[PDB]
Structures are given as C-alpha cells and as structure tokens.
Amino acid sequence: EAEKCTKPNEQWTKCGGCEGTCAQKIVPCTRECKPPRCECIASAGFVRDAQGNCIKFEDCPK
C-alpha cells in the first residue's frame, strides 16, 4: 500500500520529475526519475497544466 497524499492528483510516485501533459500522456525520459515522493501520475491519466499544475485530463482547458 503506497502512502497517499492529502490533495487529489498529487499521489505517491516512485519516479517523479517526468510525467504527461494535455498533449503528451508520456514524455520521453531516460533514467532521470526524481526520488520517490508525492507527485503527479501519468500512468493514471493526470496531466500538467501550463501553470505547472497537476490535474485530471478532463480538467484540461477547453
């Protein structure tokens, strides 16, 4: 059971730093994964808004 965070979206991830966007569910990345910590999750369907804000894909701008 991976500890969960308090705010939505931001959830436990074993590899942060890289993620997805409203245009690229998965961004190409090498062995550059930030340490394990609460953050966004592309494997789930969360994207990062231009405001560097992790939010569901449905919460994307029109």
From Swiss-Prot:
SUPFAM superfamilies noted in UniProt: Serine protease inhibitors
Domain of life according to the entry: Eukaryota
Cellular component terms (Gene Ontology): extracellular region
Matching InterPro entries: Ser_inhib-like_sf (IPR036084), TIL_dom (IPR002919)
GO molecular function: serine-type endopeptidase inhibitor activity
UniProt keyword annotation of Transferase present: no
Disulfide bridge positions per record: 5-38, 15-33, 18-29, 22-60, 40-54
Name of the protein: Trypsin inhibitor
Protein source organism: Ascaris suum
Upper taxonomic lineage: Eukaryota, Metazoa, Ecdysozoa, Nematoda, Chromadorea
